[PDB]
Amino acid sequence: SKPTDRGQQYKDGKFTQPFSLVNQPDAVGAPINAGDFAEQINHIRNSSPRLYGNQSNVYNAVQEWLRAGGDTRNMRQFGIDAWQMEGADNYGNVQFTGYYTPVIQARHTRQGEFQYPIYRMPPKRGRLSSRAEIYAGALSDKYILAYSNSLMDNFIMDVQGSGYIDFGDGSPLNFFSYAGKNGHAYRSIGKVLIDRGEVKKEDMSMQAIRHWGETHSEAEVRELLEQNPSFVFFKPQSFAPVKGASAVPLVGRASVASDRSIIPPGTTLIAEVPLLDNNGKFNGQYELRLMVALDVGGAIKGQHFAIYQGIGPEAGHRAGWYNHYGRVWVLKTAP
Amino acid sequence: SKPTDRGQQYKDGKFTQPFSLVNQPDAVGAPINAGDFAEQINHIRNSSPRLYGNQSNVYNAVQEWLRAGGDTRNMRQFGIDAWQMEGADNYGNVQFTGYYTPVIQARHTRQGEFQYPIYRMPPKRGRLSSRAEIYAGALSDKYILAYSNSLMDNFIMDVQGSGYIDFGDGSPLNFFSYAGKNGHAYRSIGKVLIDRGEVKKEDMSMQAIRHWGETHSEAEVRELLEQNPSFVFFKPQSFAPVKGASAVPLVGRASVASDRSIIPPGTTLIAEVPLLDNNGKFNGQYELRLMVALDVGGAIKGQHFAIYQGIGPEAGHRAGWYNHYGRVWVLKTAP
Amino acid sequence: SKPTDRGQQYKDGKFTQPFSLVNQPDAVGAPINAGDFAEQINHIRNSSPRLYGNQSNVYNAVQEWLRAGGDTRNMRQFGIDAWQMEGADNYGNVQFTGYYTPVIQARHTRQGEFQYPIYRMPPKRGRLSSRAEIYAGALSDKYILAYSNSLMDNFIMDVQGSGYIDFGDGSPLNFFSYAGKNGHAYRSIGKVLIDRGEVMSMQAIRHWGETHSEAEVRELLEQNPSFVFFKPQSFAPVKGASAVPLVGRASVASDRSIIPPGTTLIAEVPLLDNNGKFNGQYELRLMVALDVGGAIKGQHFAIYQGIGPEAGHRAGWYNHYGRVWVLKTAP
Amino acid sequence: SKPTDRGQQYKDGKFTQPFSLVNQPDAVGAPINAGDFAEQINHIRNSSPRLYGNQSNVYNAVQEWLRAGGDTRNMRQFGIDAWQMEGADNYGNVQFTGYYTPVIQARHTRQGEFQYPIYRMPPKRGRLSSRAEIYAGALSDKYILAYSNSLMDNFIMDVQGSGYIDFGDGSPLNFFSYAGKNGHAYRSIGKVLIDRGEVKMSMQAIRHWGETHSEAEVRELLEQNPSFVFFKPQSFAPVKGASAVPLVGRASVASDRSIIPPGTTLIAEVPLLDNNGKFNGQYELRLMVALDVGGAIKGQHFAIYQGIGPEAGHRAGWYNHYGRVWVLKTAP
Numbered sequence A, B: 001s002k003p004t005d006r007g008q009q010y011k012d013g014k015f016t017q018p019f020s021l022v023n024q025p026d027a028v029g030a031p032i033n034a035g036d037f038a039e040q041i042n043h044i045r046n047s048s049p050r051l052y053g054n055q056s057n058v059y060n061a062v063q064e065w066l067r068a069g070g071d072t073r074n075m076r077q078f079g080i081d082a083w084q085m086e087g088a089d090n091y092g093n094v095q096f097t098g099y100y101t102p103v104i105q106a107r108h109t110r111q112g113e114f115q116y117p118i119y120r121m122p123p124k125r126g127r128l129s130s131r132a133e134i135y136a137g138a139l140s141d142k143y144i145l146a147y148s149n150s151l152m153d154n155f156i157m158d159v160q161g162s163g164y165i166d167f168g169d170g171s172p173l174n175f176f177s178y179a180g181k182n183g184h185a186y187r188s189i190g191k192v193l194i195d196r197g198e199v200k201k202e203d204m205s206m207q208a209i210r211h212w213g214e215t216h217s218e219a220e221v222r223e224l225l226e227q228n229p230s231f232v233f234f235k236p237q238s239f240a241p242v243k244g245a246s247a248v249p250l251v252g253r254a255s256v257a258s259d260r261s262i263i264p265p266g267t268t269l270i271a272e273v274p275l276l277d278n279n280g281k282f283n284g285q286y287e288l289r290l291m292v293a294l295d296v297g298g299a300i301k302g303q304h305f306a307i308y309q310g311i312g313p314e315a316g317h318r319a320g321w322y323n324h325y326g327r328v329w330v331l332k333t334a335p
Numbered sequence C: 001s002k003p004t005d006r007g008q009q010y011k012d013g014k015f016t017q018p019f020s021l022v023n024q025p026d027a028v029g030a031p032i033n034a035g036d037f038a039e040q041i042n043h044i045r046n047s048s049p050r051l052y053g054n055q056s057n058v059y060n061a062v063q064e065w066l067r068a069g070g071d072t073r074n075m076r077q078f079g080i081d082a083w084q085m086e087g088a089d090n091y092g093n094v095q096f097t098g099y100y101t102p103v104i105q106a107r108h109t110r111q112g113e114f115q116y117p118i119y120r121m122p123p124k125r126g127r128l129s130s131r132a133e134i135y136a137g138a139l140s141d142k143y144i145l146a147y148s149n150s151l152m153d154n155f156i157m158d159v160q161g162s163g164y165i166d167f168g169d170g171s172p173l174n175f176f177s178y179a180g181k182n183g184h185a186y187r188s189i190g191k192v193l194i195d196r197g198e199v200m201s202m203q204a205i206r207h208w209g210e211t212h213s214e215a216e217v218r219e220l221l222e223q224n225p226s227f228v229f230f231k232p233q234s235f236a237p238v239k240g241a242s243a244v245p246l247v248g249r250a251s252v253a254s255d256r257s258i259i260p261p262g263t264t265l266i267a268e269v270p271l272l273d274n275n276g277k278f279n280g281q282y283e284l285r286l287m288v289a290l291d292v293g294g295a296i297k298g299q300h301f302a303i304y305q306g307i308g309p310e311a312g313h314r315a316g317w318y319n320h321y322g323r324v325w326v327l328k329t330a331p
Numbered sequence D: 001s002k003p004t005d006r007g008q009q010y011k012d013g014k015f016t017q018p019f020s021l022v023n024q025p026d027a028v029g030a031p032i033n034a035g036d037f038a039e040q041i042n043h044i045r046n047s048s049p050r051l052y053g054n055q056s057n058v059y060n061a062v063q064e065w066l067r068a069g070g071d072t073r074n075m076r077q078f079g080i081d082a083w084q085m086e087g088a089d090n091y092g093n094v095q096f097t098g099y100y101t102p103v104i105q106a107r108h109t110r111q112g113e114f115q116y117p118i119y120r121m122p123p124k125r126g127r128l129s130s131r132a133e134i135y136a137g138a139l140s141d142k143y144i145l146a147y148s149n150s151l152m153d154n155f156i157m158d159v160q161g162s163g164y165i166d167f168g169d170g171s172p173l174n175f176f177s178y179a180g181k182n183g184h185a186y187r188s189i190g191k192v193l194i195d196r197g198e199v200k201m202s203m204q205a206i207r208h209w210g211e212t213h214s215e216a217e218v219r220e221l222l223e224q225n226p227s228f229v230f231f232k233p234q235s236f237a238p239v240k241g242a243s244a245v246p247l248v249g250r251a252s253v254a255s256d257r258s259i260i261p262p263g264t265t266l267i268a269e270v271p272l273l274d275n276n277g278k279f280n281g282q283y284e285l286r287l288m289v290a291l292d293v294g295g296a297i298k299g300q301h302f303a304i305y306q307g308i309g310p311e312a313g314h315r316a317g318w319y320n321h322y323g324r325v326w327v328l329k330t331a332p
């Protein structure tokens, strides 16, 4: 059977095809984020008018379904078709990970605890340098945007793709969007902790990496972070909503990152997101949510989704545990 | 015959107790404002430490319930007891009105279209003057805060209790909170219009009032508005969140105004809010929302609630329609 | 023949060259916007690190001058030069015009008074359409950003190059930066008002629009075939060509060929009342060239007034002259 | 016996009165903060039309003078009466101190480095507790507004009278205004370290001391000041003082309302000092308005409002010098 150690349900049948057109999905009650789904869609209308035009009828259809009852048994009653996904094992288990938008403090000039530079997009040959070399000073100081008080925060923000920069002087939070990356492949840092016997395999998470950095010295932290030759460059947007690859403001848990080749942007997705406590342990229950694919990821390929948790600490704690599975139905309207 | 033109529903029977302990509420699905409610709780937590301290048990219970997918049936596992309100008709149906926070365009000094003063709290004897007298100049110019471009906007804001003031110069919107009122009783203008013979009986709305003001001249608008001797004074909070009587930042459609004697502040309320189109016509469907009583009103007494729609024009259009009914349950703890 | 209405000077003599190095400028005394200038300096540091690197010396040179005091007679003790610019009449009268960042209210969807679209950058062939054609609907609705309540406001913002958009719903003001323009040359509106004779400034044109009907206003505005496209920066500071946040009356638009960006300029800006009449007195200010303009060529500057109505009233009247010195480091 | 190390002078002559009508001010230069001064008048015109309504006569005179060049040699041509103040030494030099509005980062709930509570106005009997007792938990947790990451920052903000609170979550900076104080007299930590023999006082030097020593050592030192200030959140409102008028950086000062009432225009020779707070020897001409008060600001003494932020704090902590000042009024 499918060990539910990471949330693997099997109460639907046996659907192997990519888009398994089921009559109506397995679920009790209405989705938890109905009104929240409306906001997400509204953003698609103003931020991507061409993407909205292609999915107008789809969005308008599910809205009435939510305003009437919301039960996954009253979908076809409005011409909505649920196309279940095969997932990993092809039995019905789609991978679910998570990411958020962290807020970090920094200064325009280095001072005191602020000695860690955040770089912008450099020239063609400047993007060749690895993370370790950049730490040593491979890039010119004119490409620095700010200096943070934590090398770990910069690394986490690097992994997330973006983040708000708080200068702590009164000015609004500047959104440092994903502008580009260096010519080096991304390599797992948490794995390096397991390679030398520093962190447990079963107890691998966001809090473990952060706790490790506080337990060890700066030299030991820098050495570990350098094991990831990849480095991300940002572009200041100045208090703009969190936007992904689709250039549409992402809403907390109402949007996900996907493989554009399989699941294109603007795709409505209803899924059973597995719940977990503060310790990230799978309790056994799920959560019905309506989300839209509006972002991409280097590690997000095939039957895999990256649920956008939100902005802030609480959104980060919730995002670090997500490496579970669950079912998902691609919602399409009848022609 | 049982009226259903407004938005009444008779199927849960007649309730004798002001609060009938019904296990599972007659909900259509799940809370569509999980994020709005959670936000509202966090606002009470940081703005009203003692009010939150007492209702914290309920707040943590309903949030954990919302986490479980917001299952209106499984909420009993969390010990959440639903006490359905008897309603104004004792059939579970309760009156639902609405108010919002209008954004008024103004200037510090009178110029061009900006010739309508917004006053602050004057001395004891200055608060005796009626609206008509204040329009003629009963108050000193040193009590003026700003000059708007519409007498109708000032009147609507007066009725709402507060509103944001946009100076259109780059500076943030200043929140003019309810500071006080004059020594004259309030008299509805909607009644005056019907009785005057201009506006029709059933064809009354806050929209028709705004349209009427644009159809008629300044002298005709002023004369009509003077039929309401009451006048509200404001106090600029300088870009502060919209706060009500409880001094807690109000969240759009996640908070309501109530009679503190019957429904005290901090009370969690799950309700079936009747939906209505752009023309304010009751289509027939409802909406499940979790709201908290955090404000009061002069016309809000007994079995009656004033749903805080939000900030802006869209929030105003949605607010100036509500004179309908719907079911509501007062969420509490064990008996 | 020999006017002094626009603040023209003669008390300096003819200038035989564009820039003349003096010793103690003919200015009044101490600058008023010493603080605003400092705010402009760090803005260049944060925004354009390359520009701040080449002019770091100049910014710090004048930084010590104002720190102590700010007397125009004594500047050499801080290592500063004073290259006095000439003018049209060659008497040091540098032309000073003005522009600001207007705040226009609008919604995402057309409703009521909001029926005037604000467009973004369309494709290559979509940029060929003239203003009159775009008004009639030459561009697709998917290129619309917002709908304003005034066609005149959209036109003024079009002329200014940018503007803040207030959606009146609580959300922050979205800065619609200059993204591009259409394939048509700019035509003057006052020009058309002279043809049939009806009227002069940005204040006189605004009054004309209020006096005449919508059909008469649209017809006049269509006389300018040029149309500007914007790009929402989502609540970002007002930036010009140099991509540096502009500070009110502490920055100006110039001809990059003559006066390159990052150049410090101390000038005697001619004052004027609410009616735009030159009273006779000047104002000493320190400003930096951080923007450009299509009509800003040669010995001419466009003083950035600021954001809002008051900044617009002040900018619409500005078409006067004044002296200006290019502050550089002593060799 | 005439000191000059702290900015004091003698080229003005000894005074016989607090204020004296001077036909021509003994100071060369021009108001280098004319823009900041004009900004203050607009703030007094919007935030307090009552005080402005009776102080306009002086502003209109100092504005007409400013617009018409701004040369101190023509002030009488606009109706501006200069009044030389004696200060500490009857030679025209007044004691100039400074304060600013610190931006502190804090959270609504205690977590990690954020373990230092910022309290609001408690009941009558709750205001009796001293700082040391409050640190130990004399006040209930329901009176806490936020938890900062530095006990020193809280102390400095306490001395300043107010400060902006940055929650680092996106929300605007909340201005914690001076709501009240406890029933204990203020004791400067400066006098403590001066007597202890650990000074090279400098209110910023103590900041370095706090970072050098541990939490227990910092708390112990701070407990020497029994006074404790309570704040009131205004949520992104301009820095306002006692006059309830938004203060402008170095264009406003705190004064003794009995001697120098609020709304009073003051032109002064503010003594300049380097990064190390050493008096170089030069001054600075500034136009300022009295719009705030202070417990230690009595008689011939002013507290120059430096501004908001770190740089404003470094500049403020050094001020303990002297300089000449003229009370600008109208000519009868």
Ligand SMILES: CC(=O)N[C@@H]1[C@@H](O)[C@H](O[C@@H]2O[C@H](CO)[C@@H](O[C@@H]3O[C@H](CO)[C@@H](O[C@@H]4O[C@H](CO)[C@@H](O[C@@H]5O[C@H](CO)[C@@H](O[C@@H]6O[C@H](CO)[C@@H](O)[C@H](O)[C@H]6NC(C)=O)[C@H](O)[C@H]5NC(C)=O)[C@H](O)[C@H]4NC(C)=O)[C@H](O)[C@H]3NC(C)=O)[C@H](O)[C@H]2NC(C)=O)[C@@H](CO)O[C@H]1O
Pocket (backbone or CB within 6 Å): A097, A098, A099, A100, A158, A159, A160, A161, A162, A177, A178, A179, A180, A186, A188, A189, A190, A191, A204, A206, A235, A242, A243, A244, A245, A257, A258, A295, A296, A297, A298, A299, A300, A306, A319, A320, A321, A322, A323
């Ligand atoms: C040891 C170990 O392995 N532990 C595991 C741990 O790693 C796991 O944690 C999670 O890991 C995953 C994978 O490592 C992390 O995944 C992140 O996912 C996010 C979102 O999916 C990624 O961020 C997005 O990245 C894409 C690029 O791939 C961005 O897309 C780009 O967007 C820009 C605009 O910003 C586009 O540029 C614009 O282009 C237009 C058109 O050409 C042009 O006009 C504009 O000018 C231009 N704008 C600019 C500024 O240039 C660009 O075209 C587009 N690129 C593409 C290809 O479309 C997107 O914007 C990013 N989204 C946001 C938001 O910023 C992120 O890259 C990815 N990281 C990695 C390393 O892959 C995940 O973050 C992480 N989560 C957490 C909490 O740590 C955990 C799981 O919990 O498991 C452990 O076992």
Ligand SMILES: CC(=O)N[C@@H]1[C@@H](O)[C@H](O[C@@H]2O[C@H](CO)[C@@H](O[C@@H]3O[C@H](CO)[C@@H](O[C@@H]4O[C@H](CO)[C@@H](O[C@@H]5O[C@H](CO)[C@@H](O[C@@H]6O[C@H](CO)[C@@H](O)[C@H](O)[C@H]6NC(C)=O)[C@H](O)[C@H]5NC(C)=O)[C@H](O)[C@H]4NC(C)=O)[C@H](O)[C@H]3NC(C)=O)[C@H](O)[C@H]2NC(C)=O)[C@@H](CO)O[C@H]1O
Pocket (backbone or CB within 6 Å): B097, B098, B099, B100, B158, B159, B160, B161, B162, B177, B178, B179, B180, B186, B206, B235, B242, B243, B244, B245, B257, B258, B295, B296, B297, B298, B299, B300, B306, B319, B320, B321, B322, B323
């Ligand atoms: C025929 C029919 O059915 N017609 C329908 C029509 O009625 C509907 O339209 C709606 O009508 C209703 C009724 O006319 C309108 O109701 C409005 O509701 C709002 C919110 O409930 C009211 O605004 C609140 O008013 C209360 C006072 O009553 C305010 O509370 C005060 O708050 C201040 C602080 O702001 C407190 O002062 C502070 O006190 C503390 C402690 O003492 C002190 O320390 C502070 O210093 C001090 N602060 C200051 C600044 O002084 C004060 O104590 C407290 N007062 C009390 C008693 O507690 C509260 O703040 C207001 N809320 C907000 C937000 O501002 C409003 O007054 C009320 N209007 C009227 C006329 O009663 C409703 O607005 C309207 N809606 C619309 C859209 O028009 C329509 C709707 O569709 O349907 C028709 O069918």
Ligand SMILES: CC(=O)N[C@@H]1[C@@H](O)[C@H](O[C@@H]2O[C@H](CO)[C@@H](O[C@@H]3O[C@H](CO)[C@@H](O[C@@H]4O[C@H](CO)[C@@H](O[C@@H]5O[C@H](CO)[C@@H](O[C@@H]6O[C@H](CO)[C@@H](O)[C@H](O)[C@H]6NC(C)=O)[C@H](O)[C@H]5NC(C)=O)[C@H](O)[C@H]4NC(C)=O)[C@H](O)[C@H]3NC(C)=O)[C@H](O)[C@H]2NC(C)=O)[C@@H](CO)O[C@H]1O
Pocket (backbone or CB within 6 Å): C097, C098, C099, C100, C158, C159, C160, C161, C162, C177, C178, C179, C180, C186, C188, C189, C190, C191, C200, C201, C202, C231, C238, C239, C240, C241, C253, C291, C292, C293, C294, C295, C296, C302, C312, C315, C316, C317, C318, C319
């Ligand atoms: C009858 C009569 O004549 N009456 C008089 C009346 O006309 C007078 O009114 C005044 O009129 C004048 C002239 O009509 C108005 O002048 C305006 O002046 C402003 C400021 O100088 C101009 O706005 C600037 O325009 C330039 C382009 O010309 C903009 O520069 C561009 O900036 C963008 C970024 O925003 C750059 O793009 C970026 O490029 C980088 C690098 O390649 C790339 O990486 C980025 O991605 C890219 N970003 C984007 C978004 O694309 C671009 O490269 C650059 N262009 C160049 C060439 O460098 C600049 O940003 C604008 N500034 C601002 C701020 O937006 C404006 O164009 C100009 N209007 C006209 C029609 O020429 C003046 O405004 C007006 N004043 C008033 C008050 O009405 C009155 C005087 O009051 O007197 C009557 O008598």
Ligand SMILES: CC(=O)N[C@@H]1[C@@H](O)[C@H](O[C@@H]2O[C@H](CO)[C@@H](O[C@@H]3O[C@H](CO)[C@@H](O[C@@H]4O[C@H](CO)[C@@H](O[C@@H]5O[C@H](CO)[C@@H](O[C@@H]6O[C@H](CO)[C@@H](O)[C@H](O)[C@H]6NC(C)=O)[C@H](O)[C@H]5NC(C)=O)[C@H](O)[C@H]4NC(C)=O)[C@H](O)[C@H]3NC(C)=O)[C@H](O)[C@H]2NC(C)=O)[C@@H](CO)O[C@H]1O
Pocket (backbone or CB within 6 Å): D097, D098, D099, D100, D158, D159, D160, D161, D162, D177, D178, D179, D180, D186, D188, D189, D190, D191, D201, D202, D203, D232, D239, D240, D241, D242, D254, D255, D292, D293, D294, D295, D296, D297, D303, D316, D317, D318, D319, D320
């Ligand atoms: C060894 C040694 O001596 N070393 C030196 C060292 O000491 C020096 O450091 C400096 O020390 C001095 C003195 O200790 C510090 O001076 C500070 O100065 C500031 C400004 O002058 C003071 O802050 C103001 O305090 C007043 C009260 O005194 C506040 O005024 C109150 O404002 C509130 C509103 O906020 C009013 O309440 C309102 O009232 C109305 C009407 O009744 C009501 O309607 C409202 O509801 C109500 N609002 C509320 C919220 O309740 C209230 O009425 C009014 N009070 C009065 C009496 O009018 C004012 O708001 C504060 N200003 C700001 C801004 O907040 C501060 O108290 C004072 N500190 C002390 C300890 O006295 C100075 O800060 C310090 N500087 C530094 C850098 O440390 C250094 C200097 O370099 O030199 C060493 O040598």
